[PDB]
Amino acid sequence: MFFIKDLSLNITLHPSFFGPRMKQYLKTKLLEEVEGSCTGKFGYILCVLDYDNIDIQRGRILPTDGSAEFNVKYRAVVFKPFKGEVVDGTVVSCSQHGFEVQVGPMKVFVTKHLMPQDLTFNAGSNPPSYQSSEDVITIKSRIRVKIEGCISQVSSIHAIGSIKEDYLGAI
Amino acid sequence: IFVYQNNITPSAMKLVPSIPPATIETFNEAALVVNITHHELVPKHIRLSSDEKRELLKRYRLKESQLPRIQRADPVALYLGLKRGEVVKIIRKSETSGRYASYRICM
Amino acid sequence: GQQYSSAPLRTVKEVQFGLFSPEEVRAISVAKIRFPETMDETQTRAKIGGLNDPRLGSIDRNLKCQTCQEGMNECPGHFGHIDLAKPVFHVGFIAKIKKVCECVCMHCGKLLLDEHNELMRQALAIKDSKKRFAAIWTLCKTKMVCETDVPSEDDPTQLVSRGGCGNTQPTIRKDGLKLVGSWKKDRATGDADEPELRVLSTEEILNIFKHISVKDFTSLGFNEVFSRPEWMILTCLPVPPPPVRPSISFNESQRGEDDLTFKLADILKANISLETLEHNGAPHHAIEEAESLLQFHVATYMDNDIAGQPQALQKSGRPVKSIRARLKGKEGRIRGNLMGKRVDFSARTVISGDPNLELDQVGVPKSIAKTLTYPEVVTPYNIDRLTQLVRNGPNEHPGAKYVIRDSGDRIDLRYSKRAGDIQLQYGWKVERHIMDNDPVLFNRQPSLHKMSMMAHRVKVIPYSTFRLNLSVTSPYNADFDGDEMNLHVPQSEETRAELSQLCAVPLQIVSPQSNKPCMGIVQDTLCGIRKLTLRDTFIELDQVLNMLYWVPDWDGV
Amino acid sequence: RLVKALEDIMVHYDNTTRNSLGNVIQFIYGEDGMDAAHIEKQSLDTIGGSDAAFEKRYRVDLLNTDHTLDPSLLESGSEILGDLKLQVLLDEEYKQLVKDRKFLREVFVDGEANWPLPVNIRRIIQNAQQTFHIDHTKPSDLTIKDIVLGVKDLQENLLVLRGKNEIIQNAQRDAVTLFCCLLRSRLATRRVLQEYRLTKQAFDWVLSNIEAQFLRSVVHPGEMVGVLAAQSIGEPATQMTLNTKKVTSGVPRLKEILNVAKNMKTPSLTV
Amino acid sequence: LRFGEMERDCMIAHGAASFLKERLMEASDAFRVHICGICGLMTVIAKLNHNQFECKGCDNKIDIYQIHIPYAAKLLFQELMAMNITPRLYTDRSRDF
Amino acid sequence: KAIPKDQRATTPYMTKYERARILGTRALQISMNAPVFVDLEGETDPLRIAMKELAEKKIPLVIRRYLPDGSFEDWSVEELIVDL
Amino acid sequence: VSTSTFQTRRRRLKKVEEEENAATLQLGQEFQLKQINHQGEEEELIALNLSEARLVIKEALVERRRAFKRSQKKTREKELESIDVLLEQTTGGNNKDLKNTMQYLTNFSRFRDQETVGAVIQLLKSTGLHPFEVAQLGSLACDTADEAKTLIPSLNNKISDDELERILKELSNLETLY
Amino acid sequence: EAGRAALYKEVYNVIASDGSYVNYRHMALLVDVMTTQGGLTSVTRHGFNRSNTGALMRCSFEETVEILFEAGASAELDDCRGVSENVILGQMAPIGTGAFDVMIDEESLVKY
DNA sequence: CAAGTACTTTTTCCGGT
RNA sequence: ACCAGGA
DNA sequence: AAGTACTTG
């Protein structure tokens, strides 16, 4: 995945900023509002591309107030995960319920029951782990999880994933 | 054009649209005694070509709706044998400009 | 004011009319609306989970809304619903409901005529939905039989089957809120003499309507998304929130319920009877009795000024105020609350003419200036002026009433402990008194003119009247026999410009109504001009010098 | 009713008169594209009088020893006599002035000369006379070409409609038709030289002023002429009441009119 | 003071578009409703504090606007809805012309 | 579809309404502490500052003239003739 | 106020179906193959492989520093420390999302240099596979065509096992070291 | 065309009966409005208010509810081009000052 | 094809029982 | 709300 | 009430 999606955003500047550092304050305001943000629709809007050529266009002056509205058009690198998406990630936390794995900007969590049977939760370790007949999944471990489904929420997207199927698991 | 003295039976009147692309016009002789077009209040109405009409509409950025309308049944529309959708250019004298050009689309 | 919402602010570009589908009513609804009892949880002052706030709006101004948290001035009321025990005709639509019945087959829901008929295909051709439905109805009314097979688009010998159903169509007539048909009959070729006379049930019509084809109703006036014909028959009734029907709540433990709140409770009461009646041992006539009762209340809630006499008057003899009548013109929503409004920054007094005022000015009493305010934003150019106006306060003439911080809050210079200690920052508004030379809209009703409302220059003066130049009398049609005039103060630089630049008195001098000036020299000045401009009239040096000094633009020559 | 009927009508940026549907009511506002405020009851001289008197006014014949402009009217006068090329210009001038006379006489059948029109030409001339201290004795620094051609050019600059195509450019001519009829009658060669007695500079200023004054005189796109008309018809009807053949007259007849009353009170013919 | 129809009519004759707006809005009525982008009604259960928006019956927790209309218009609309008519308000346009 | 500058066909002069709206807008911005593009030659009023800015044609505003069909002509204040 | 697109769809009243997203290559309405760039042109969807991705963000942020210091006029773990430093200059910091992503990319990138990523992009962008498959094939380390056809089920009938295996062999070759 | 000329003649004859004068154009507009649609559209609820303008607009004169009721039943879509609709919507109408839009051009802003 | 019904509105703004 | 008034 | 538009005989 990790797409490049062309997008726009309406910004309402106040008359006080109608100085020649116009494009500047707008491009900056755009970067504040959009970068690091996360919606469900486009996912994680991570990094705005081609600052030098960010299109301001003309801004219409809103009638009974002074402020002007510009539809800033722009291109950005986004991250929307999907169900069926297979992702290589690093483990973060690990409870008796399962292990949450950091995959880019988002965390995919694996249920104890979404893991192969042989993998058993070992409480007695610093830090807590999952022990197989020959394998060990703990805090710093690298994994490959299949995303079973997502939950688009607030300023994030979290998801449940499996390591049950073939070619999935620790690396 | 079929000029009739007194009447045409609702019987014979059924044959009127029977032979297209050719068209038929029923005219009561008694109406034609005086030419209406010649009157004080009747300005030069002019039939437009499909090209002239295409131009009128293009030049004023109009939909056929937006244009003033001449009734199909209209005495001048009849005299000219206006067909639904045909535009007429009306040239009238103005106390304001001297000469004002108007347009009416058929109905 | 009203709080900040992160929602993008836009304008209404299009208004898409339609009809509430019963499923939408039940979806949008935040409560159902089971009890005719207003509130008082068994006398215990608070709302009942039945009528007015079973999640709805909010009665108590000191109580936040149950659905949205916001409360009173922020919270638009939230809708509810009542599932009607039996479907009912929507008063407004009884008209169309009949004409639609008159157009369709009362058994299969097929259009009585179709593309096979030449006059029909012609009317089906009409582009306008209203004119098309008009031309359809006039043709389809007369077709008293749903045709099984119609003569084909060639010979009458070999006829092609269109839609089925042989069935005779009723001769529908309205019996006030009721629709009753008279099916032709066939009996031994002739008969009628004496046909089948029966009332068409709401539910039977509903079902026939349901079966009208998407192509068919779209050929009729209708649209498959926003207005299906089935949506003219009310199944689920939307319950307007308190804001629509406010309880004019006098004292503490004392009611004041709105007309609509009672009218709904009637509908509720009328329904619960009809409901329990059919769930119980249905006496089948006591059923069509309690049904017709509910059909009436649901009719008389929306419209009470119905043709068929019963005026559904409140027990006081006073007729119930229908929603229809709230919206009906000149005094009433559209014409009275929206096309015109009662407004703030408006002032009115007795007018009197002054020869010592300039044409474009308007004598304004000090009281009126100390009252009327202009919101001026703290800028470096006015920072010091404004701090003095603020210092002067609400009572000195060149003073101010309020100080508005960026912090959204209003300071009352009249009570604030900091009314002296006040230190203005750029970007704050100061609600100052009207000052000399401020542009104001001045007007005299009737107002048959562009000219009857002109922008003037303020001139604060003593004595309780509006003073105006005598020449400016003519456009307003004012005299000083006890006439009063209104003043409106603009609230922003944007609108001050509008007044000064477009509607100032000097601009209005030459009238387009008649291509001539609509202001001249009148009365004392006109009578005295003739007298002075005579060949007999001569002025001695003494007077002649004052005569000169009096012209403020005099060359000194 | 008059307001509610017209409200939505205004002048859009193409001088068109349209309602909320963009439906064309008038092609050009009030048939001329002018603002009612910038119009005065000016007189179209050309209209009436004897055909004989019209000749005496507008006719200049450099080919006749008597009918030429006397060299007291202009410096050229002496060297102008019998110029065949120049007399062609004066022949166009007079032939166009005659065309005008006939045209006006069709438009205003009764010969009513006084018609409200933009730009007060009379006043502009008067002002040139007191501005330039026009000595009614000394001959002018004007050529026939200075006048004849000058007016021809001034007309090309009296812009109502702007579009670069036949339809609009014809609509432009049509909109300006009667104003020029006036302009030509008032600015004819003999009239300028013998009556007004203008210098080249004076005349040059009279032209620019007519032009500027003309351009101001046009309607402004945005003007709500719907409500304007409604009130301009309406207000007089209200003072036809509020203040102090026998055909249905006044207020009830206006009622009859708007209502399009079929069964009218005093129906009549004028045979 | 009543700024009546006649009074509105002069303001329109003048072409004082903003001054008219001001009178009818800031100087009188003016309210802020939250409208849905799907079914153009005042359906939004806006908890503008928690920034929660929602129009259940549309499951729309996203495509929501805010408009400034005279409080009497907010009324009209609710009164028309109470009478079964949907006066759907949209911020985009489809038609053209 | 937005008419191109070389095909513009409206008045080259600034309509009474345009004038008033620009003056009002500028005055609304100047008053809202916007940057003044002229030399305040001792001016305290934002409308007078707007007039001053307009006379020197140093107003950064563009009038979008909508035609009845929807299309528009963009005109700068700097280019519009001010006969008013 | 939130972010708008270029996908216009006039959804009047008609709410839902919104048919679930998968590896039936049924991504969003937004993440359609026939997507449309703002300059009017209809351009095919852009999916990046972790590294094809890393190189974009790096480049964009580097060019940003250039423009930020234009207005201000008037080895893997060593690549990671330097990135956190470039970010410290061009980003908002509050954007932990990008720092988190930058570390992820830096760690899990399969191809170090633009020269390499160029050749990778060429190889896969010839298979006629859908933008997503191409990206997944670039960022997921598979050996058997089965590993690939199992992890990228969308491929299942779209390519020869042998042909896919040829690609996989040539990806293993381009694969830069650590 | 003759009906229009007669109509003006007749309207003008009433205004001029009182003695008073009204510039042509005004009367010409009323006359032209009653004309355009094909025949004689009356200045009554059966005339202009029956034409295909805005639903909210028409409703604001004479048949208020009846109008909004049929608007509902036939799923009418209001353009919102009429003065009336904007007043009802509390928005700046496209009248004079509202007949255009205002924009800041950055390039000219940085130029000054 | 005619008489008879069901329809709709009628200027603006500004103290008391 | 009706009644009474004012221009 | 007055006028019309619209059905109904």
Ligand SMILES: Nc1ncnc2c1ncn2[C@@H]1O[C@H](COP(=O)(O)CP(=O)(O)OP(=O)(O)O)[C@@H](O)[C@H]1O
């Ligand atoms: N009922 C009413 N409705 C509307 N306007 C009215 C009105 N009564 C009075 N007016 C206004 O006031 C004027 C009438 O004033 P009146 O008090 O009747 C004395 P008059 O006999 O008209 O003498 P005058 O106008 O020479 O001073 C009208 O021209 C009108 O604008």
Ligand SMILES: [Mg+2]
């Ligand atoms: Mg008086």
Ligand SMILES: [Zn+2]
């Ligand atoms: Zn609430």
Ligand SMILES: [Zn+2]
């Ligand atoms: Zn049938």
Ligand SMILES: [Zn+2]
């Ligand atoms: Zn919704």
